[PDB]
Amino acid sequence: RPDFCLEPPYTGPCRADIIRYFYNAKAGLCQTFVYGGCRAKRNNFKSAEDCMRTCGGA
Amino acid sequence: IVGGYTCEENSLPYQVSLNSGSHFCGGSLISEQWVVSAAHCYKTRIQVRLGEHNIKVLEGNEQFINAAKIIRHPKYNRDTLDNDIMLIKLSSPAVINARVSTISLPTAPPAAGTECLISGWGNTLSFGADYPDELKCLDAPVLTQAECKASYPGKITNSMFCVGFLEGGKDSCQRDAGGPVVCNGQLQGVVSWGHGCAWKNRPGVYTKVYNYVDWIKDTIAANS
Ligand SMILES: [Ca+2]
C-alpha cells in the first residue's frame, strides 16, 4: 500500500523487453508491462506475488 | 524497429534472437561460438536463436543453442548506461551456412553520415505494442557526436553514439536491444537506449563496438 504503487508504470529508456509487473490502482490488480531493462521506478516487480505483497490490494 | 521494412528472409545471417520464454533482445553472431549483445539484456540463462526470420513459425533454417557463458562488460553501469555491451558463448558452435554466418568486427568507427542497417524484432510502433513476427530492417545514418550530445544533454558517454533521424518516425525500439547496427560490412553498434522510440529529436543511442574490439578478442581467447 505504499505511495509508489500508485505511480504509472515506466518502461524506461532501454530497449529490451523484460516482463515485469506493476500495480494498476485503477483495476485494483497487478498487471504486466514491458520493462526496457534499466532505470526502473519502484512500481516494478519481478512477479505478481511480489507486486501483490507490496501493493495488494491497494 | 519503427518506420522500417521487413528484411529479405535470412539476408542478415548474423542477426540472432535472444529467447527466455519469448524473444527479449537481439544479438549479433561474431564467431562460430560467440554473440555480441547489450549488457542490459543480461539474464542468467539465454537461448540463442540463429537463422530466424519469422520467430513464431519453424521455417527450417533455425538453430537453437543455449548460452554456456554470459559475460557483461566489467565497466557496465546500469544507471549511466555506460559500456552497455555483453558477450555470449554458445554451448556448441553454430553451423555456419548461407543463412547463419558472422559479421566482422570494425577496424575504424563509422563516420557521421554513414548509412547503416539496424535490425530486430522490436516494437514497430512509437505508441502501442506491435511486436512483429518477421525481422525488420531500417536504413539510418550515423549522427555527429555533437548532435547526439545535443539531443541527450549530459547523457552520452564515450561508449555511445547516435544513429537515426531527428524528425522522428524511424528508430529501434523495445525488443531490439542488443541487436546490430552494421555499416560498411562491419558491426559498428549495439542497440542500447533512447527516450521513447522514434520521437522527434530523440534518436537511438547505440554502443560503439569499435571501442571494445580488444575486449571482445581477449574475452573470447580467455574463455576458450
Ligand atoms: Ca522461425
Automatic annotation (TrEMBL), chain B:
What UniProt keywords apply to this chain's record, in alphabetical order? Answer: Calcium, Disulfide bond, Hydrolase, Metal-binding, Protease, Serine protease, Zymogen
- Record-linked InterPro entries: Peptidase_S1_PA, Peptidase_S1_PA_chymotrypsin, Peptidase_S1A, Serine_Proteases_S1, Trypsin_dom, TRYPSIN_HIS
> Binding of Ca(2+): at which residues?
52, 54, 57, 62
Q: What Gene Ontology terms for biological process does this UniProt record contain? A: proteolysis
Q: Where is the Peptidase S1 domain?
A: 1-221
Enzyme Commission number(s) from the entry? 3.4.21.4
Chemical reaction(s) catalysed: Preferential cleavage: Arg-|-Xaa, Lys-|-Xaa
Enumerate the SMART domains for this protein: Tryp_SPc (SM00020)
EC category name: hydrolase
Q: What cystine linkages occur within this chain?
A: 7-137, 25-41, 116-183, 148-162, 173-197
| The keyword Zinc-finger appears for this protein | no
Q: What GO molecular functions are on record for this protein?
A: metal ion binding; serine-type endopeptidase activity
List the CDD domains.
Answer: Tryp_SPc
Q: What is this protein called?
A: trypsin
- Please name the source species: Homo sapiens (Human)
